[PDB]
Amino acid sequence: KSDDVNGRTKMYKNIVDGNHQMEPGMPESFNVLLKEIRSLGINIELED
Amino acid sequence: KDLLKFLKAQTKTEEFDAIKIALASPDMIRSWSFGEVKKPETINYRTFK
Amino acid sequence: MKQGLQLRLSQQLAMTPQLQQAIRLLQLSTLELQQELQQALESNPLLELPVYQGETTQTLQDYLMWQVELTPFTDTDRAIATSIVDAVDDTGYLTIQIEDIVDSIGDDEIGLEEVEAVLKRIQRFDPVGVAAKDLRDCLLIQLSQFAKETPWLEEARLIISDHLDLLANHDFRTLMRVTRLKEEVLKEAVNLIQSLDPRPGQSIQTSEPEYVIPDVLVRKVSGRWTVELNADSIPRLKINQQYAAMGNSARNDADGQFIRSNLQEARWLIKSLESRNDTLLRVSRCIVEQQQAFFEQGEEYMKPMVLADIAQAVEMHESTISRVTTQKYLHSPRGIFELKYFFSSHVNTEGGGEASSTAIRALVKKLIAAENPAKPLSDSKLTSMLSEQGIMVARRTVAKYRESLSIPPSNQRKQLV
DNA sequence: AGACGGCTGGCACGACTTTTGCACTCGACTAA
DNA sequence: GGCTGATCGTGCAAAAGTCGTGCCAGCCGTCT
């Protein structure tokens, strides 16, 4: 029920098909935050 | 491009664990960027492009 | 001395040449002039939130994508459907060809049968006839959507099949001769076919306002018309007072010379801009004086106007008038029209009248609109209307005006009442 | 079923418009 | 020489385009 665009349609199709399985993805608000931090002279990145 | 995994490659993510943060470097900033802005213009009202 | 018209004597040259700055000023560039001024001000150093729209309208592209996701299809089938959705026109038709789609697929296993199956599935969508790229195909799908209980269904299908040409030319007699259909019973089927919602994908498009910024505004409230330019749109430049107060105090000859040159250039540019603004205001006032007669006479009875006639109303050369008229727009209570739209050719009329081409076209369009649908007005018949107007005109050349108004041929405009 | 009839439509010559491509030599001297 | 600098500078004209209006060749709708 959040900004995960790829997750919303997936969950809707799952409910239509009665899957009831949750696929996380990763919220776009975090992407916005990362871009905003990078807009400053600040280095930030997500490792593995 | 066979276009079947091309769409699939769009939906991908890393572990993203143990994120850190530190100071930046200008060459790194240029790496982040793809181009440089050089005019204060934002949008045209003649063609809306 | 004496008054005379002898034609042999000495003289001097004409107006002095190479007035490039004045030539640019005479031409109106609107925002382009603003951009040039910004560039010059960059060259000249002595011159001077929480609320967001947040709208995610589907535009029927997202609706189509959701339908594709909600529909059961193979991975190849899903990819083909996505590719088909990519090549969809705003009106609801497919921009690319089926062979073009197959080529874009670039798969040997991909076949025309699969493309046809996808199109049928594509046809199997709301609205019907999606990306049909063929009016008959979309019409056929829409007809197939409805039930067969409706009367004149098979006849309508037959007409849509291969009788489109007669309807295009409105060839009712030829269509009756060919299809051997019931006379005047086909009118109901024709009306039903007219009730087929052509371009069903047009509903996807949403209206977007056209931001038109006028230059001159006219009110004429209680008479007393007064032309006023858009003060907000009026450019304004400022002199750098801090830079101005540092020229004499400079102890360096190079710096002082540079400051003096920049000040002279800025003064010349400001003078040119002010002169251009004043000339534009004077031209607007003269036009409004001319347009007041046109505005009172109305669009139908608009008087003819000449470029030389307006240049006479002003003191500048007609070249300046032509340059100023370029990229010129103004706002009036009746509406907003280009300055050049005022000028029109003068058509010799009965009693010696000179008839504006635009006004003549408007009157002809009004007359043609008020015509019998069963019998469209003929171009030769338009001569009778022109004679009724009491003003001579060129009926032979009136077809050019009719085509200019995008008026279809009268024979082609014929339709059943 | 072939011919009148008005349309249609381009082509032509006048008749109005039009854009751009145009800066001397000063009054300082400038003397070899 | 080599242009070299500078009051002061609100067309114009000339070849080019573009339209006005008429003028002829074809075409189909038709009824003799």
UniProtKB/Swiss-Prot annotation, chain A:
Subunit structure, as described in the record: The RNAP catalytic core consists of 2 alpha, 1 beta, 1 beta' and 1 omega subunit. When a sigma factor is associated with the core the holoenzyme is formed, which can initiate transcription. The rRNA transcription and antitermination complex (rrnTAC) consists of RNAP, NusA, NusB, NusE (rpsJ), NusG, SubB, ribosomal protein S4, DNA and precursor rRNA; S4 is more flexible than other subunits. In pull-down experiments interacts with CedA.
Stated role: DNA-dependent RNA polymerase (RNAP) catalyzes the transcription of DNA into RNA using the four ribonucleoside triphosphates as substrates. Resistance to the antibiotics salinamide A, salinamide B, rifampicin, streptolydigin, CBR703, myxopyronin, and lipiarmycin can result from mutations in this protein.
Domain of life assignment: Bacteria
Post-translational modification: Acetylated on several lysine residues in the presence of glucose.
Similarity remark: Belongs to the RNA polymerase beta chain family.
Biotechnology: Co-administration of salinamide and rifampicin or salinamide and myxopyronin suppresses the emergence of resistance to both antibiotics.
Portion of the full-length sequence here: 1294 to 1341 of 1342
Protein name in the entry: DNA-directed RNA polymerase subunit beta
Native species: Escherichia coli (strain K12)
UniProtKB/Swiss-Prot annotation, chain B:
PTM info: Acetylated on several lysine residues in the presence of glucose.
Biotechnological applications: Co-administration of salinamide and rifampicin or salinamide and myxopyronin suppresses the emergence of resistance to both antibiotics.
Coiled-coil ranges from the UniProt annotation: none
Family: Belongs to the RNA polymerase beta' chain family.
Described function: DNA-dependent RNA polymerase (RNAP) catalyzes the transcription of DNA into RNA using the four ribonucleoside triphosphates as substrates. Resistance to the antibiotics salinamide A, salinamide B, rifampicin, streptolydigin, CBR703, myxopyronin, and lipiarmycin can result from mutations in this protein.
Subunit structure: The RNAP catalytic core consists of 2 alpha, 1 beta, 1 beta' and 1 omega subunit. When a sigma factor is associated with the core the holoenzyme is formed, which can initiate transcription. The rRNA transcription and antitermination complex (rrnTAC) consists of RNAP, NusA, NusB, NusE (rpsJ), NusG, SubB, ribosomal protein S4, DNA and precursor rRNA; S4 is more flexible than other subunits.
Protein name (record): DNA-directed RNA polymerase subunit beta'
Protein encoded by which gene: rpoC
